[PDB]
Symmetry: D2
């Protein structure tokens, strides 16, 4: 279903947030070199 | 260099933002099914 | 630990494989428009 | 266009390859801790 477009491309947003968050937590730790 | 940890894991942030935006724009286009 | 660099930047590989697969399966479904 | 699906979701494959490659090159460098 072009809805299951929406759900899959939220699950994009959400894992590509969890990208943002791990790759901040990349920055901070590689702050602590 | 653990600065170049920082920059690479920023370039993490910027692209995994651009993940979020394009996979928003995913949700929007695939809301326009 | 710079082992836990290794594991995290494997968990990089495994998810950015699973990127490739799902964004294949993107191409296949969006070839089935 | 549900083709521009294909092109965008190749550009998925390709940047989420360039994920795979940077996050191998993550592993190797964080091999060299």
């Amino acid at each position: 279903r072009x809805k299951q477009x929406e759900d899959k491309x939220e699950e994009x947003l959400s894992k590509x947030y969890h990208x943002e968050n791990e790759x901040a937590r990349x920055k901070k730790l590689x702050g602590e070199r």
